[PDB]
Design a protein around this ligand. Structure first.
Ligand SMILES: CC(=O)OC[C@H]1O[C@@H](O[C@H]2[C@H](O)[C@@H](O)[C@@H](O[C@@H]3[C@@H](O)[C@H](O)O[C@H](CO)[C@H]3O)O[C@@H]2CO)[C@@H](O)[C@@H](O[C@H]2O[C@H](C(=O)O)[C@@H](O)[C@H](O)[C@H]2O)[C@@H]1O[C@@H]1O[C@H](CO)[C@@H](O)[C@H](O[C@H]2O[C@H](CO)[C@@H](O[C@@H]3O[C@H](CO)[C@@H](O)[C@H](O[C@H]4O[C@H](C(=O)O)[C@@H](O)[C@H](O)[C@H]4O)[C@@H]3O)[C@H](O)[C@H]2O)[C@H]1O
Ligand SMILES: CC(=O)OC[C@H]1O[C@@H](O[C@H]2[C@H](O)[C@@H](O)[C@@H](O[C@@H]3[C@@H](O)[C@H](O)O[C@H](CO)[C@H]3O)O[C@@H]2CO)[C@@H](O)[C@@H](O[C@H]2O[C@H](C(=O)O)[C@@H](O)[C@H](O)[C@H]2O)[C@@H]1O[C@@H]1O[C@H](CO)[C@@H](O)[C@H](O[C@H]2O[C@H](CO)[C@@H](O[C@@H]3O[C@H](CO)[C@@H](O)[C@H](O[C@H]4O[C@H](C(=O)O)[C@@H](O)[C@H](O)[C@H]4O)[C@@H]3O)[C@H](O)[C@H]2O)[C@H]1O
Ligand SMILES: O=C(O)[C@H]1O[C@H](O[C@@H]2[C@H](O)[C@H](O[C@H]3[C@H](O)[C@@H](O)[C@@H](O[C@@H]4[C@@H](O)[C@H](O)O[C@H](CO)[C@H]4O)O[C@@H]3CO)O[C@H](CO)[C@H]2O)[C@H](O)[C@@H](O)[C@@H]1O
Ligand SMILES: O=C(O)[C@H]1O[C@H](O[C@@H]2[C@H](O)[C@H](O[C@H]3[C@H](O)[C@@H](O)[C@@H](O[C@@H]4[C@@H](O)[C@H](O)O[C@H](CO)[C@H]4O)O[C@@H]3CO)O[C@H](CO)[C@H]2O)[C@H](O)[C@@H](O)[C@@H]1O
Ligand SMILES: O=C(O)[C@H]1O[C@H](O[C@@H]2[C@H](O)[C@H](O[C@H]3[C@H](O)[C@@H](O)[C@@H](O[C@@H]4[C@@H](O)[C@H](O)O[C@H](CO)[C@H]4O)O[C@@H]3CO)O[C@H](CO)[C@H]2O)[C@H](O)[C@@H](O)[C@@H]1O
Lengths: 565, 563, 565
């Protein structure tokens, strides 16, 4: 039987003398019953004392803890469900665990982290694991720059062998008080080191970061981190849900997020600003936040099976805003985009700026009666910006009673759709026998007063303006037009879309929209100019018919036939 | 030294009196050696006894277990490999574990769950973890409606912070005896609550559900659950592998399945019936089951890198059947579709109904000599239904010795391919010096007797029916025709496919099929009317020519150029 | 209180006699403090002793270890941080663990595996888990054929119930000394069994395999294994990073890799040679290695959100080489392709052979000034081989100052682009008034001397050779030409690309490249013949202008407009 000691204090005070003897510590703190274990006496060891796994008695004799498996924080005097600052004990336990390439467990309970000293996790040596349940790390009184950083101390080995073997952080709810200047998690390094830090294959999993300034911020050497079941919400910074600043060194390779939830920012968002940066999000959700991309160049974001939505929010914030730079690519593959009603969606929820690319694959474009994107764009479409959009396997909501809209200018079926030619070329104008009829291009005459429009004022007989383009099945389509009836003696006309085969035979599937009699700029086509491309179609023809005696302006004649583009 | 007690019974019987004293329980059950630990005496505590972590001695004094890490079921008297019902002890241990936001471990062994009382896991509080190995939960004698449900007790906090921190279920083989009315796992809530249940980020991993009525069924509040390495097999219900019923409240956001296996249903299948429901399957396999989607609208299922196959099965069941509703989308991206031989595949293995969409990306369409889809469709193609099919990066098996077939009517190269115009518009008819030979549209004369056909009976000189459409390289093509020869002297004629340049000159790569001399409706083109689109092609031409003395009906001239 | 014994030896030596008595083993090895636990005396057990969980005392009485949870290797006398061969104790502990369907833990430490006896993990019964941290399994002195194999003992059940419930291997750095004939991990069976082995749902996670002959090799029954955070590097075999040999039985269903890193092979690579084999790589990276696919038929590899790159390498090795077979499909969806500078990239980094297919989706094609692919291909393009390439949502680096290049021959905008017709068909020749100007096809006259070229030698007035093809928005393009000026009186001419709508109206977005005056074969178009397709474009026209008095050969006029119409 091994001699027994009821507390770490009693273990240290006893004049141990039997080299090699095993002794039992019953508890670190007297009367608690946690943090005990077996220790081997070594009278000759000169190992450094740490009051946890290497204990120096008052006579200098060492007691060396026998550990099997992970180090536990209570071995260093940490206590569960305590008001005392636990960060010193966790930091000391972590320093030791890292020194022997062993993970650190924190027993499930609540903890408070106070002070201002970050814990720097070295993923090549040891992770910190809340074990096991809903481990709560209250950092509301912490005043340092970052609570945790994760960054390797090695430039190559053994990081290339070890980072992947265990997570760097697991099982922790880490939260602040939205104090300015206190970030939650730094992924990588604050400043550029003299050598690189080999961080690839480091995992953060089953953690929540909440109520920091930036909850999660990428630093230098942020490459091939993976995140599983990570939640980030309710940060202070406009960029606080997840921030990738510009100018990072040795960063950007396949930052990966599996089933992560980025949400309820209450003004905080995701912003990717670093060039040459590649991120992959699988089955993630982006809720009540915007995903900004303003990298100078070469950002590639791939969202596979993700959701973008606004649950319970009246905000007109965008979902994805690729706003600057060139050669930036954003993929939405599968998943969903959900647009619950709000007082009026007055800007595009997706935006892709010049020289950038937004790709939609296998996803349904939503529609809602509250859509009012023309307030921003001048016309009724889902996506803004002068970049490029592609579609593959995209579904339109062709049976939505409120309507459907085209997705983007870059998918325009018809040439000179916005009268950007500065004339009516590409359009066939047929005034018929109306010699007094007038059809004219007008500059600064569209909805904004800054764009071209086509004015049609027929006399005696109606005027038809039309255009034909090649089309093929399979496909689905939606068109919107901006129309301003100045005067009309009745229904002012109709916009129609029809299909022909190669032989010129008219096919089923034609649709039309009456213009009515209401004056002023209005959207025509929402629940009328839409449908499926009929099998056998080889041409699509748009016709704008204006009746005799009417005076109507047309702008932004935007049809999209969605197919693989 | 801490005083020691050899059993929970002895711990409770002792007249504890020293407030604050630590004592050691050696074992819950006498002589077993499981479930012991340190306890702290509290003479003043009024905590409720649970015979596990809060023990009330016979004199009223409390003993409070010191726990570090998860709660274990043996702390409440559960025993491994016992014939006694373990569900009460696990349920009591779980109630406590959940009350202190701590997961519950069940030591690896076999357990019997009897009775009829489900365990309701609250993923915002605590999961149940089989630790660690092949933990066997025998529910063959359980008679309740569900074994496990998983549903948060919170509408927002702390669920928004906690659901993701640990799994709800891990490491368990949970099985029944296929008793009607006994389901395995309920994902969410049976009925609509007064407020919502915040379930997002809840995980089920490394579990098998087997031999229930419905193995896995979604309830209300089924949103952002994730499943990893979950197996579901051999259920009783036609919908028993995975069932998402219609009409769920607060459900449908990104239900996610990673490397899950849905298989060997022996009559049970997957069915998604809820509208506005979005599911993602990554490297899953669907084996010897059908994936049905009949949501009224707005289902989106994305299968990335999955396999659909029929290993060891003679069944002609479909693989994917999007059978009703509108605005339903099913994506197959990468992965594989495997069609082992059976006595005859008499219906299409993929089906997409009107107003729905089936997208194929980066996957190879298989072919097998046992394919007989015409028995359903009237004609030889891989996919059924009046919906829309798209392809991107799809490969055809052009060098499959048994043949190749077109994929879908919605990809038809040619106009009026099925004589659905009600006339021969879009088709060029040339008998040359056409006098006494017969070429006629016949209604209700095709393979099923309900569709149009074209009859040709030459006496004079042969007839050519032709059509040209634009095409571009690169591409792969396959055509099937339905042909009915009544009589002919020798070879009855040929169907040919040729390619032209922009100016109309013929290119290499043309193919043809002899009609032969067998009578009755037959498929022409399987291993003949297929190939790669030749370099320089800008037009594709189909030509049907019939010889003197033959009398032949033609129907369903279906070419697909994929790429 | 339970009687206590200080070592396994002392436990065995004692004359136990009281059936049912619980006794405490303090340590397996005297004085260490590891491997102890409670044992129950059993006078009725006739179980075979294993010196771990079933102990036979010197009088024959059995002592049955009370275990809760996994078996631990130290229960069988394994020791941490020891230079004794630990493989026998681990193997004995594993044999027992599998026999009771319980996983085996190895306490985190370093271990040496010597000898030549593999451990055959049965995933239907038990995994081996390094617990928990950077567990180091030194196999440098092991001389057997494989260190670990993973293969089920069952043909159906309970493998169909059990394989998925726990990993087969977790948390281990397993390494050799690059000895020929010693592989690290065999996935499945070495030879075909008479019955199948049901391996689906078996996981290997958080392991590194390093410095073996083949680090990871697929055997028979290799189906529905999943790998998470697995590293494979620095193998000896040319195929040693990951090898899937031809001829495997019962194999190929959805072999799945999540966030795995395949890298730094120093001559070792990935090779997929088995037919009817389907692999999925999600957020993996392939670094300083080639991914070879030479399956006879029906390989399907899907890479979602992966990176292919050459960090720190001067090697001109390919990234992906689909080199043989037919009906092989390789998908690159999202992620990145990175081509750091080297002395000159003289072959294509992607190659797809005849009858195979390489699909690019939502990824940016890189460009670098060191690109010299024409040394292999004859012309300046990114991808080699006579197979097919498709694009969907692909971005070109249109603003890269060094240039941009077309991707592949199969995406050629223009017909007879390589003069492979053996004539000048599809090209429109306009000599103007200069009738004696020479425009001719020349065989074996291109850059390699084995391909056709077009010689243009105008007299008096310049000659224009042109071609028009259909195009549509959305799109972007890059063209390269091989040009050989023999003689010229000045700037030899220019190549230009312009866009028209369906009605023949000219659009913005035209580009041109001067030929200059330097003689000899050169690439024209790198930073000139590129751009975005204008909205409303329905035709693209290339024109090659050669001035009077110039004598120029043209070859390989390769434009790619992505997506190709
Ligand atoms: C305004 C609007 O956009 O309406 C859409 C619905 O239109 C309906 O047609 C009517 C028109 O709106 C009316 O204006 C009028 O129009 C008539 C014209 O049609 C006619 O031509 O001319 C008439 C004049 O003479 C004119 O009056 O009447 C029509 C007919 O009534 C329907 O089309 C309806 O479809 C539904 O019903 C039809 C049918 O019975 O005919 C069925 O076929 C459909 O299956 C059925 O859906 C339209 O509803 C949308 O339908 C889409 C498919 O076409 C579907 O994709 C879409 O659902 C998506 O969007 C909703 C809202 O964003 C999502 O719902 C959310 O889901 C979340 C979970 O993911 C959940 O958390 C959300 O709850 C939160 O938010 C809600 C909320 O209000 O949004 C709150 O209530 C909660 O408190 C909060 O927690 C929410 O449920 C869904 O997931 C997504 O798929 C349908 O909206
Ligand atoms: C030669 C080369 O390819 O240059 C490309 C850059 O061209 C620049 O233009 C200049 C030309 O090169 C010059 O030739 C000349 O050209 C003139 C013409 O412009 C004019 O019209 O005609 C003249 C004829 O008379 C002609 O002389 O001058 C021009 C102008 O200066 C720029 O275009 C440059 O872009 C950058 O600057 C522009 C700008 O300010 O105008 C910005 O708009 C861009 O945003 C900015 O990038 C070109 O650089 C590339 O730009 C691409 C976008 O267009 C971008 O995608 C690409 O980056 C990719 O490739 C690099 C290299 O592979 C990747 O970088 C690596 O990233 C790794 C992590 O993923 C990292 O680990 C690597 O580091 C390791 O390896 C490196 C190494 O490179 O070997 C080692 O050094 C490290 O130690 C090691 O750790 C590496 O950083 C990047 O990730 C990927 O996205 C840009 O290279
Ligand atoms: O094939 C060769 O020529 C040589 O290949 C190996 O050489 C090793 C290789 O250069 C290794 O590169 C490291 C980087 O140093 C490290 O920064 C990290 O690089 C990533 C990069 O993959 C990605 O694109 O961008 C991220 C930043 O976003 C960047 O961090 O990992 C790679 C791969 O491990 O460095 C070691 C040490 O210098 C080299 O040894 C073979 O080992 C050589 O033998 C071989 O000659
Ligand atoms: O930006 C704003 O306007 C406000 O944003 C936050 O508000 C919180 C947000 O409304 C939160 O919504 C919860 C839902 O209550 C919950 O049902 C769940 O919603 C999912 C939904 O994402 C998906 O589309 O469909 C599933 C069902 O399939 C549905 O369950 O999650 C979301 C996100 O957490 O509710 C809380 C509590 O009411 C709101 O506070 C900010 O918190 C506000 O400050 C901000 O003003
Ligand atoms: O629906 C039916 O007709 C019958 O379905 C079940 O029958 C079971 C099924 O045939 C099961 O197949 C096993 C294979 O034996 C096994 O090799 C493995 O197959 C995979 C295959 O999915 C994939 O394509 O290729 C890999 C190799 O790369 C291959 O290993 O798994 C499947 C699915 O579990 O075998 C059992 C035992 O013979 C059958 O019982 C029902 O159980 C029957 O009741 C039903 O009649």
């Amino acid at each position: 039987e091994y001699p027994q000691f009821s507390s770490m204090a009693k273990l240290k005070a006893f004049p141990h003398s039997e080299d090699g003897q095993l002794v039992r510590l019953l508890s670190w703190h007297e009367g608690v019953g946690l943090g005990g274990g077996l220790f081997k006496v070594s009278t000759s060891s000169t190992a450094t004392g740490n009051d946890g796994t290497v204990v120096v008695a008052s006579n200098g004799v060492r007691l060396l803890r026998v550990v099997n498996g992970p180090i536990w924080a209570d071995m260093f005097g940490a206590l569960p469900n305590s008001d005392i600052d636990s960060m010193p004990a966790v930091a000391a336990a972590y320093a030791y665990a890292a020194s022997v390439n062993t993970d650190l467990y924190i027993g499930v309970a609540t903890y408070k982290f106070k002070g201002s000293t970050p814990i720097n996790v070295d993923p090549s040596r040891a992770g910190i694991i809340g074990y096991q349940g809903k481990v709560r790390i209250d950092c509301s009184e912490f005043t340092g720059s970052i609570v945790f950083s994760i960054n390797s101390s090695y430039s190559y080995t053994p990081a290339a062998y070890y980072n992947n073997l265990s997570p760097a952080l697991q099982g922790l709810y880490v939260f602040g008080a939205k104090t300015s200047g206190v970030d939650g998690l730094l992924v990588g390094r604050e400043t550029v080191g003299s050598d690189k830090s080999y961080n690839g294959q480091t995992e953060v999993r089953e953690c929540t970061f909440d109520k920091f300034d930036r909850n999660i911020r990428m630093g230098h050497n942020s490459w091939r981190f993976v995140f599983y079941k990570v939640n980030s919400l309710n940060a202070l910074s406009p960029n606080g849900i997840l921030y990738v600043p510009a100018g990072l060194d040795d960063s950007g390779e396949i930052l990966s997020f599996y089933h992560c939830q980025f949400f309820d920012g209450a003004g905080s968002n995701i912003r990717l600003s670093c060039s040459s940066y590649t991120m992959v999000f699988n089955t993630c959700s982006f809720l009540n936040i915007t995903f900004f991309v303003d990298s100078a160049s070469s950002a590639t974001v791939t969202c596979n099976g993700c959701n973008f939505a606004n649950p319970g929010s009246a905000s007109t914030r965008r979902y994805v805003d690729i706003s600057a730079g060139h050669t930036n690519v954003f993929n939405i593959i599968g998943g969903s985009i959900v647009t619950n009603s709000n007082p009026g969606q007055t800007q595009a929820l997706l935006y892709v700026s010049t020289d950038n690319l937004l790709n939609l694959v296998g996803v349904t474009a939503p529609y809602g009666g509250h859509y009012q994107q023309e307030q921003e764009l001048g016309y009724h479409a889902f996506i803004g910006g002068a970049g490029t959009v592609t579609t593959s396997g995209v579904m339109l909501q062709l049976r939505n009673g409120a309507g459907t809209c085209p997705l983007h200018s870059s998918l325009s079926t018809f040439s000179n759709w916005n009268f950007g030619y500065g004339n009516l070329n590409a359009w066939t104008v047929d005034k018929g026998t109306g010699t007094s009829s007038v059809v004219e291009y007008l500059a600064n005459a569209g909805p904004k007063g800054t764009e071209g429009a086509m004015r049609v004022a027929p006399v005696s007989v109606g005027t038809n303006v039309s255009q034909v383009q090649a089309v093929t099945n399979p496909g689905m389509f939606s068109m919107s037009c901006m129309v301003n009836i100045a005067t009309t003696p009745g229904n002012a006309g109709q916009v129609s879309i029809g299909f022909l085969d190669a032989a010129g035979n008219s096919l089923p599937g034609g649709v039309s929209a009456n213009l009515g009699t209401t004056t002023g700029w209005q959207v025509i086509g929402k629940n009328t100019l839409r449908g499926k491309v009929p099998i056998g179609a080889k041409q699509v023809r748009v016709n704008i018919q204006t009746v005799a005696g009417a005076d109507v302006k047309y702008a932004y004649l935007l049809c999209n036939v969605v197919k693989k583009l």
